[PDB]
Every structure is written in C-alpha cells, then in structure tokens.
C-alpha cells in the first residue's frame, strides 16, 4: 500500500478523456476526431517514501484519429492517421509536449490535415496531460490467462508491395532473419501456415492476409505457456505525396510479463534487421 | 564541502575549471559549464562540462570509464554507469549527485530501474538548454559544432521527444549561406511566403553540391537549398521529415514543384510532343529506370538521374554500397529504381526529338547517344556505373570522331 | 556417458547430430564434425561442429553467449569465455573438456591466463585441419565457403602464425577459371615458368572486374589474374604478401611486368619519342597526377589511372572513404598521388602525340580532351570523381559537336 | 623446485644458439647470417603437476639477419632483414614452424635473398627449435633500476617521408592521437622537445632524429616510478619490392612488469590508430 501502481487507472483515464476530442464539428470543411487510444506504455506509480505524495510517472501515448479535409473539386476527402506523444511526465510543461502527428496514406489533398489539428486539437491534449497529474495526485493521495495488447508504428522507406512480399518470401525471410524453418514446400507463405524463427524461440503462424493491405500472424514465443498465443496484425499505409509506408502493428494476446520484451525484440529483429539487410530506411 | 552542493551564482569560473581538471585529464579549458539543481520531491545537483573537442583520448579503450559520474547522498558509486546518459550524448563530462536512486543491496551498482530514466531525461533536456545557451555565443558554438556535429545528428536521429528541440542546433551551408553555417530557423525566416518545403541536397562534399544541376531550377525561383556533406545528416533528415510545419524535401529524389496554371498549360502542351521520345528512351533503357519523364526541374542540363521515391539518395546509395557487412549476396535492391529526367529546353533533347520525329528512333547512333547520356547522367548525379568498359568505349569513339579518326 | 569421453570411431552420425541440435538451436545437421583428443603435455578432448550457414542470428543480443562450451573434469563451468576462440573463428559450435585448467574458488568462472592460449592454438590448428579435410569433398566445401568466406578472410588477415595455412582455403575466380572458384595452389600450378608473381585485381563487382582493361595486356602474355570482389580480400592479400614463394601483385597499383632485353630496347625507343607528350600531360594535369609514364601494361585502352606506388587499391580507397569515422577535415588524402598511364598503340595517343608535335600543347582543345580522358580513366580504374559537372559539360559539348549543333 | 621459471634461460640459450648460423661462407656470392636476436616474448615455465615434467612454453621470437646477394652487373649488394617466428611450442612439429622473412629496403635485385634463407637457414632454425625442447626437459627437469627491452616491427603502407612527418607534424599528431599537449609554439617537432599524449598518460620527448630515417624519443608513462624512463628508437625502411615502410621500433628501459602492456598500447594506439586515421595499412 506504500506504493500504488496506477498504469491501468491512467489507461482508463486516457481512454475516457482523449476520446471524443474534436477539432470542430462533423459537418465542417476540415474536421478531425480521436477515434480511440491505441496504446499507453510506460509506468504510472505513486510513492509515499518521501512522506509526501509524489508521482514520477513516465508514459508514452499513441492514439488514432479519423477525419476529413477539403479537396480541389469541392468534396470532402477522408483520412485516417495516428498521433503519438513520446513523453508525458509530471515536470513537463504545457508547450513541452511534442506531438508526432502522421497521416496514413498521405496525399497532397491531405496536406491541410496536419496544421488543422495543430491549431485546435493540440492545446486540448496539452491541457488534458496537464490535468492528468493533478487528478492522479488528488485521487490516489490519501491512504487462458490475462493478456495485454501493444501498438507499434515503425516507418519504412519501401513500397507497400515490396515489404508485403518481403514478409512472405521464404528466401528473403531467411535472409533478414538468418535462421528460419519452414514446414511447407511452397516457395512463399500461404494461408494457415506455421514456421519457426530465431533459433526456435519464435513460432509464428500466418492466419490471414490481404494484398498489400493486411498481414495477420499467430506469434508465440517458446517460453510462453501453451494457452498463451498472441495475434499480431500489420497494416500497410504507404503514402502518395512523400511515399513512405508505416506498418501499423496491433499486437494482442501478449502475457502481462512480456509486454516490454516483445517491444524491444520487434524494433531490433523485425524493424532494424530488415532495414540493415534490405535497407528499407536508414538505421544504426 | 563539495562543489555541486553550492549555489552556481556564488561559484567562480576558476572553481569550475579546477573541478574539470580534477575530474578530467584534459588540459584545455572546458568550452562550457552547466551547474543546475532540480528541487521539489526529487532533488539532484548536476554539474556538466562541455569540452572544446571530442574527448577521444581513450588510453584504456574498450574499458568502461564513463564520463558522467553518479553520486548517491554525497557518496561515489562506480564508473560503470552506461544508461545514465545516451551513447550519442556520451561526450560531455561532469558529475550528478542525488539521494533517491534505488541502488543494489551493497549500494555499488545501479541497473534495470525507471527512477534513473527520469533523471536521464532531465539531464538531456538541461543539456539541450545548455546547448541553446551556447548558441547565443557564436564563437563558442562554432567549436561546439565542429566538435560534436556527428553527435548532435545522431541525437536527432535517435531521440523523438527531443528531436524537434535538437533540430534547432543544426547548422548547414546553403546557396545563400556559402560563407557561414545557417540554421533551420534562419532558413524558414529567409524562406519566401509562397515556398512551403525546405529543400536540401546531399553529396560527398561541398564541391560536389556547389555546382549540382539539381539547384539551377530552384535558383530560378530564388529558392534556398540546404547542403549536406556528411553521410550522417541524412539519418537525421529522414527522421525529422519537417520543421515548423515545413516538410523536408530532398531534391535528389523524386518530388513535385508547384507552378502556375499558365505554366501547367505550357508544360502539358509541350510534354505531349515528347511522348515518342520518352517512349524510345524507356524501351531502350529497359529496366535501368522506372520511367523517362520530361522534367522541368532543370534548365540547361540535358538529362539527369532522379532516384525514385521510397529509395535512398545518391550519397546514401554510395555510403550504403560500400558496407561489406550490409549485403554480400545482392539481397538489397530497393534503391535500384530510378527515373530518367530530361530537360526539353536543351539543344541535345531538341535534337533527339527531331531525330525521333524523322523516324530514326531505332538508329544505332541515337541508341548509343542515349545510352551514353544515361551513363553520364548517372555519373553527374552521383551513382557508380555497372560497367565502365562501355562508357570508356563510347568516350573513345567520341574522341576518335573528334580527332578525325575513322 | 559424455561423447568427449568416448572414441570418435565408436560414435555414429546420429549421435553427433543430436549433440549439435542439443548444444545449439539449429534444426539442421552440422556441415562437418571434428572429435579429437590431445593427451600430450596438454590433455583435452574437443568436439567441434561446423554450421551449414552463418549463425549470425544473435537472438539474445548484447549478452555473453559464446559458441564454444568449456568443461573442467566433466563439469560445465560457464558460457562467457570468449577468449578461448578468436573473434573471426567464433562461428563454429561444440564443447572442449579439460582437467588442468585453473579456475576460481567456486570453479564457475575463468580469468585471463596463459594456459588457455595453448588450448586456443590447438583448437585453431585442429579447425584448420578440419577445413583442409572439408576441402577434399567439394560438395560441402562450396557450402562452407559460401558460409564463412568473410570469416576465413578475416582470419587470414588477422593471424600470422596460420596465415599461410589459412591461405590454402582461399577460393576465387580468374581469367581462366570464370566457371569455378580456383585455389591459390591450383593457380600456381598453372603458372608458367617465366612468371613469378601472383597477379590479382580488385573491384566493386565481378562484372566490372571481368571487363577491366588492366587484364587485356595481361591476357596477351597468357598470364592468369585472380579476381577479388569483396571489400575484405584486399586486406587479406596485403597481409599475406606471398604464397609459396610467389609474391602477390595488385595490378590496380604500379608494378613491373616481365619483359625481355630486346623488348626493353624496342620499348625505350618508343618511350623517348613520347616524352614531350608525357611532359604535356604532366604539366596540364598538375596536382591530379604525380607523373605520366608511357606504360605497356595496357593493350587497347587509350589511357588508364594507376595508383601511385606505396598507395592503396581502388576498392580499398572506396571503402576507406566511406568509413565515416575519421573523414573530418579530410584526414585521408595520401591516395591522391595517381599516375596517368597511356598506351601509344591506340590511335588516340598517336593523334595526341601528332598534335603535340605540331605545337598545340597549349591549345584548349587538347587541354579539355586530355582532361576528359583523365576523368574517364579515373572512372574506369575504380575511383570516384570530383566536381563531375565539368565532365558532364564536356560530354555534352562532344555530343553537340556530334549532332552538328552550331 | 617443482616450478622453474625458464624465460631468461630460454632467452640466453637462443642468444647462444641462434647467432653464428650462416647460409654458406662470406667468400660466396650469396651469403646470409643471423646477426643477433631482437626480441623473445611470451612465457617459458617448467612445472610438475601431472606426475611428469612438462613445459607449456609459449614464445615468439624475432631476429635480425645480415648478408649479401649477387647483382646483375657488378659486385654483391648487401642487405639487412628480420626473421619472425610467431610460435614455438612443445607440440610444434619440425615443419610446423612458420618463418616471416622480411628484408629492409628490399627491391627486385634483392628478391633472390629470401629463397637462400629458405634453402640454407630455415632447416637450421627448425632443428634448433626442435632440440630446444629436448635440452629444456633435460636441463630443468625433475629435482638505476633493473629494466628490460622489447622489439616490434609494424607494417605501414605509406612512403617513409609522410610517415616520418606524421610523427612530427603537431596537427597530424593531434589528428592520429586525438589528445596532445605541446609546450613549444613551433609547428614541427624539434630536438629536445617534450610533449604530452594520450590523456596525460604518455610523456614523450624527441631527443634525436634523422631525415626520414631515424626517430628517437624518451618515452615515459605516468604510473611509472620517477627513476624509470624508457628510450624508443624507430627506424624507417622503404622497400622497392613490397612498396611499404617497415618501421622497426625498439624499446629500452621498460620496467620488468610493463612489457606486454606497452606492446599492446603501441599496437593499438600507435599502429592501429595511424592505420585507421590516415589509412597507412589495413585495419579491421
């Protein structure tokens, strides 16, 4: 009771507050709205060791947004995107919150989407993050199994089709993984196919796939229990103006004791290795 | 009494110099000093030193002698603190004293905890503030940049919450700043009202980009273009992607330059006349380029090679192809896609258009000249040839026909 | 019963396969097995396995997971001993059991000592013997080469006691072995009686080396020349310096070719008449080249660029210019002492000599022609260009004169 | 005693045996002779632990040779050289020894020097190394301050002039050392000039030097005692056959427990740093 973990309370507070925030109305020429909060990573603890209630929470937030902007023909062009802030803390200032705003399948007609949310959506998130600390210090001041889900958004410098076939080509998969075991004679991955990776630690299973659109795998690590089988979904969002792809990864079914280990393993063995072998973006 | 426990306003410069000479083996005066203190419910006093040059002496290389020392309740802990400061920022020196660090059982080791990460973020943000304070003094900022440009670029490439903050410390040359290193803020303040993109170009050196043909058109519109000389600045530019609402555009890659409606009409009525020439160039170049397009991003250059988007740059391809451990079996081919850009206001392109209008699109001389033009475009763009023997033979043929040799 | 306690003649293949699949994470069979036992002044039993492919997965990165396991009196000690096997050889798997190794108080950790060095030497020599045994059956030797060519090249570059021993495993292509990778012993076996130098040439890829002009004259005298493609062959070759008494000669740099006395007497009369042409070349090029000599190491190429003696090869310079660790302030510039070699057998050099004889050594046409010839020779030799805009402009000028542009 | 340190006895035995061997007579047209032993590094101990006398000696030998070869026009041409044996051990076969033969200022008219040594001097060294273990097991079987000297031979791919000026140009010195402190304002190093290197650990002073041929410094380390000061002598040699500069370096006055330390420090901070900064040779 001396220390109170409030990561779930912070997740619920963010899912209650960040949702419904709109930059205007649904009938405006330029409109945006946070659909839901994708991921809340980090830690949110309240300690009473110093005698006074303190909160040293270190959190990173990522949300998804949907809206519509103007076009040259007079019609409203919809757009889906993501907004991720890498740091919200107790000592962060109102103007210190850096908002990484990105638009999936970005086009020239969507160029007005970025400044709009920068003028009417950012201050609301800023004041919400500012009030989060005071609500946390005022609330908790006085004295199969359970799985979780994470969200990743790596940016690759590669066309959607190229990366899609790279995630399926058995030879190229063995190239960028350096250790692969396929149990089917087929040259490429097909529906309902299992294969082993990374010295037996990784056992994945392609469940569903869409042409250059979606890839669903049943990822599972060898140390996990038998009923714990995670499901990872990768969505391609290649752009048309700047021509960049952003592999939106929704990773559910992860045990409560590996949600961090699965993250650093992906940014190194699934993002960095591909960018080093095939060179799909500068990385070090 | 230790130095970090005193008020910085009551500490002289000679005291900081003596502290640096005691904690560091360097004999030169530290370029900058930063003594700050954070209060509230968590307290730590940190004195950070910025050397005048890179501290790459390393008399005990491969052994951990980290620069930032940690103190818990005025007690020294160890010299193996690695995660206390990022590796890209691991060039400054100094000490930090706190009292809330969750040490090990014996209080001689600190690892695998989150209470140190917040102090690390405080250290890096205070170092950003110190660098901004250094930026006010140009004479010291020149030395700081010429010493840690690679470090600041790696920090822009690595960090995310401080990427936009560290982007203000970047100093590069440009077409209008050939004499002094200009900043991104000085670029956007000097940017015209109608320009919406920060244009930059990379190269092996300043001499290669000072006459690059990708600038002339952007100089016709009086658009300033940044110059990149190191192979590491691209790593930061592909992570920034924008600055103050102005996105970064690499002119060596494929991009769009907006023009007026009358210009659009004059260009669409002129491209339609070069369709057979573009088709001939495309079907004679094969799969070497994705498409041959009549480009208006050049004025006097007959043709150039523009690396298609989703790929690398010229200097980026050059720095990536020279890596032995990157690819040894030809597995990476992302940067193989290119575009053959031609300028219709060049006499060579007009002669080729007249030739293909005469019907000699499949002539051996026209094919040889188009292949030589593609090769010299690859050359002037910054790409190595697949086989210099064909280029050498074509050059020798041109020389022989110039010296009246039949 | 442990496998290292039994004789290798009583162990079948399935037991070795099971041991390899249990000590490692691979599902495939090992490429080669080596179960040996030394019982002299040093007593140890070692079982080694060669993986089919390079085990560069490193799933648990940044932690001590050395490949060779250590055992003292049939007792596992630790898995952190990386000094037992060299860093270039740290790709094979297996175990090594001994009884004379001194350990710590608890006998779970090993520190630096000299007794492990002799075990390391025995391990490396037995692995060399195993590689020589693999050389007997080419079906597995081609896989072993395609797997650990870089490893064996780093090994022959680093080590000097086993440098000549590791040189026997080198397999490359040549002018007479374009279909299969030949060895150095097979190369010196086909060496004529008048040749005493192993000639080799390096490049960025096989396509450029196969069509390199430096081989033409070398193919006229029926001299076989080896080809080097990877950026690591140059270093191993300059570390070897000789093979079975035959010195390694890099033809991209200056060297001496075999010739008779009558050949020298017939070539000096042709060199003495081209001396004013060479002086014009020298005083026109200036700093770019240190000397212009009439070379006979070419057959039909009008000109070429040969790195000045005591310099670097083309591929070595191309990789070292891209290391991106010390290129600040241009610290590496010693390779700029090139040499312009000319072949007077080509009509271009004859016409240039005639123009010089006419007295046009200062004409602008001769100047820009020899400049363009210099850039194209530097291109064909494998070096990058500086300010290629002037080269492209000269190419466009020759194109305009070819298209009858007034 | 059961343990006998025999490094000095091995050194004196090699100095008594390796010298005097000659590849014929001085009256011949082609002659070679080992002048002296340069350095003998490693360890040579005789212990009794396995019920029998053993000697797991690990030694590396380097010697100098002088002689003359036949020319093509007139009298004989003299030559200096070095012979490096990187390994002599108990399990070394008579033919397992590898001999690194090098000739200072070697050229074409000198290329016939090595085969002679390979036809007359190599078997003598082989049989000497073979009998060394026998006499070792037969002799040591069952029952100012004192300084030393070492010798190294690094290889550099650069003309001798540039490498010589590299050790004198203060700017190039600060380039290849990245830490330097000079007391004089002169741009080039001069005689009797002291300067600090490598973070206050290296105290050197140029005491003598010749034009592109000699470089004599007084070397001193900070952790060394007061009356301990070492003397380094470096000599350049431009070969016209390998086209490299074989700079032979000789340290005198090294303390009794700093030989391998200064050897590694020179091989890493003096040789490898120059070979990576200026590219004067291959480094990996």
Curated annotation (Swiss-Prot), chains A, D:
| Up-regulation conditions | By heat shock.
Establish whether keyword Cytoplasm is in the entry: yes
Its GO biological process annotations read: protein folding; protein import into nucleus
Tell me, in one coarse class, where this protein mainly resides: cytoplasm
Q: Which superkingdom?
A: Eukaryota
Belongs to which family? Answer: Belongs to the AHA1 family.
Q: What protein does this entry describe? A: Hsp90 co-chaperone AHA1
From Swiss-Prot, chains B, C:
Q: Which GO BP terms, alphabetically? A: box C/D snoRNP assembly; cellular response to heat; proteasome assembly; protein folding; protein stabilization; response to oxygen levels; telomere maintenance
Descriptive protein name: ATP-dependent molecular chaperone HSC82
Q: Subunit details for this protein?
A: Interacts with the co-chaperone SGT1. Interacts directly with the substrate CNA2. Interacts with NAP1.
Q: What is known of its domains?
A: The TPR repeat-binding motif mediates interaction with TPR repeat-containing proteins.
Q: Which family does it belong to?
A: Belongs to the heat shock protein 90 family.
Q: What induces it?
A: Expressed constitutively at a high level and is moderately induced by high temperatures dependent on transcription factor HSF1.
- Entry keyword set: ATP-binding, Chaperone, Coiled coil, Cytoplasm, Mitochondrion, Nucleotide-binding, Phosphoprotein, Repeat, Stress response
Which positions are annotated as binding ATP?
A: 107
What molecular function terms (GO) are annotated for this protein?
ATP binding; ATP hydrolysis activity; ATP-dependent protein folding chaperone; unfolded protein binding
> Which organism's genome codes for this protein?
Saccharomyces cerevisiae (strain ATCC 204508 / S288c) (Baker's yeast)
Where would you find this protein in the cell?
A: Cytoplasm; Mitochondrion
Q: What does this protein do?
A: Molecular chaperone that promotes the maturation, structural maintenance and proper regulation of specific target proteins involved in cell cycle control and signal transduction such as CNA2. Undergoes a functional cycle that is linked to its ATPase activity. Interacts dynamically with various co-chaperones that modulate its substrate recognition, ATPase cycle and chaperone function. Required for growth at high temperatures.
Q: What else is known?
A: Present with 132053 molecules/cell in log phase SD medium.
* Gene Ontology CC: one annotated term: mitochondrion
């Amino acid at each position: 009771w001396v220390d109170k973990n409030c990561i779930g309370w912070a997740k619920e507070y963010f899912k209650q507050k960040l949702v419904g925030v709109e930059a205007g109305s649904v009938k405006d020429k330029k409109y945006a709205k946070i659909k839901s909060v994708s991921s809340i990573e980090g830690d949110c603890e309240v300690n009473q060791r110093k005698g006074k209630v303190i909160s040293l929470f270190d959190l990173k937030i990522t949300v998804l947004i949907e809206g519509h902007v103007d076009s040259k023909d007079g019609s409203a062009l919809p757009f889906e995107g993501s907004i991720n802030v890498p740091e919200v803390a107790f000592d962060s200032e109102a103007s210190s919150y850096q908002f990484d705003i990105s638009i999936f399948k970005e086009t020239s007609e969507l160029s007005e989407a970025k400044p709009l949310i920068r003028s009417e959506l950012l201050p609301k998130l800023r004041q919400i993050f500012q009030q989060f600390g005071k609500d946390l210090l005022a609330t908790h001041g006085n004295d199969s199994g359970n799985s979780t889900s994470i969200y990743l958004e790596p940016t690759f410098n590669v066309p959607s089709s190229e990366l899609y076939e790279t995630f399926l080509d058995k030879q190229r998969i063995l190239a960028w993984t350096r250790s692969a075991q396929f149990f089917n004679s087929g040259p490429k991955l097909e529906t309902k196919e299992k294969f082993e990776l990374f010295g037996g630690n990784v056992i994945s299973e392609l469940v569903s796939c869409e042409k250059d659109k979606k890839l669903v795998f049943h990822w599972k690590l060898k140390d996990w229990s038998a009923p714990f089988n995670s499901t990872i979904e990768m969505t391609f969002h290649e752009s048309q103006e700047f021509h960049e792809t952003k592999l939106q990864v929704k990773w559910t079914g992860i045990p409560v004791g590996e949600e961090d280990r699965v993250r650093a393993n992906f940014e190194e063995y699934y993002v960095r290795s591909i960018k080093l072998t095939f060179g799909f973006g500068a990385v070090l | 009494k230790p130095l970090w426990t005193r008020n910085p306003s009551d500490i002289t410069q000679e005291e900081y110099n003596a502290f640096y000479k005691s904690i560091s083996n360097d004999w030169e005066d530290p370029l900058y000093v930063k003594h700050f203190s954070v209060e509230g419910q968590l307290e730590f006093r940190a004195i950070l030193f910025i050397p005048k040059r890179a501290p790459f002496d390393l008399f005990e290389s491969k052994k951990k002698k980290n620069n930032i020392k940690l103190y818990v309740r005025r007690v020294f802990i160890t010299d193996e603190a690695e995660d206390l400061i990022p590796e890209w920022l691991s060039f400054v020196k100094g000490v930090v004293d706190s009292e809330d660090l969750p040490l090990n059982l014996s209080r001689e080791m600190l690892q695998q905890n989150k209470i140190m990460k917040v102090i690390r973020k405080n250290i890096v943000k205070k170092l950003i503030e110190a660098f901004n304070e250094i930026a006010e003094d140009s004479e010291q900022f020149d030395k700081f940049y010429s010493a840690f440009a690679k470090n600041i670029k790696l920090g822009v490439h690595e960090d995310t919450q401080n990427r936009a903050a560290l982007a203000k410390l970047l100093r590069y040359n440009s077409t209008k700043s050939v004499d002094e290193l200009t900043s991104l803020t000085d670029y956007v303040t000097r940017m015209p009202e109608h320009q919406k993109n920060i244009y930059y170009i990379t190269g092996e050196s300043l001499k290669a980009v000072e006459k690059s043909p990708f600038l002339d058109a952007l100089k016709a519109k009086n658009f300033e273009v940044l110059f990149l000389t190191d192979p590491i600045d691209e790593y930061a530019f592909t992570q920034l992607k924008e600055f103050e609402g102005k996105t970064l555009v690499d002119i060596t890659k494929d991009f769009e330059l907006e023009e007026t409606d009358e210009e659009k009409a004059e260009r669409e009525k002129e491209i339609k006349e070069y369709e057979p020439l573009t088709k001939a160039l495309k079907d004679i170049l094969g799969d070497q380029v994705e498409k041959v397009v009549v480009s208006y991003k050049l004025l006097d250059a007959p043709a150039a090679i523009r690396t298609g988007q989703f790929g690398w740059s010229a200097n980026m391809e050059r720095i990536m192809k020279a890596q032995a451990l990157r690819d040894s079996s030809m597995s990476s081919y992302m940067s193989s896609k290119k575009t053959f850009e031609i300028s219709p206001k060049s006499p060579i392109i007009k002669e080729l258009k007249k030739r293909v209008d005469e019907g000699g699109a499949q002539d051996k001389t026209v094919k040889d000249l188009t292949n030589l033009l593609f090769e010299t475009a690859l050359l002037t763009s910054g790409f190595s040839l697949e086989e210099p023997t064909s280029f050498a033979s074509r050059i020798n043929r041109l020389i022989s026909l110039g010296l009246n040799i039949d």
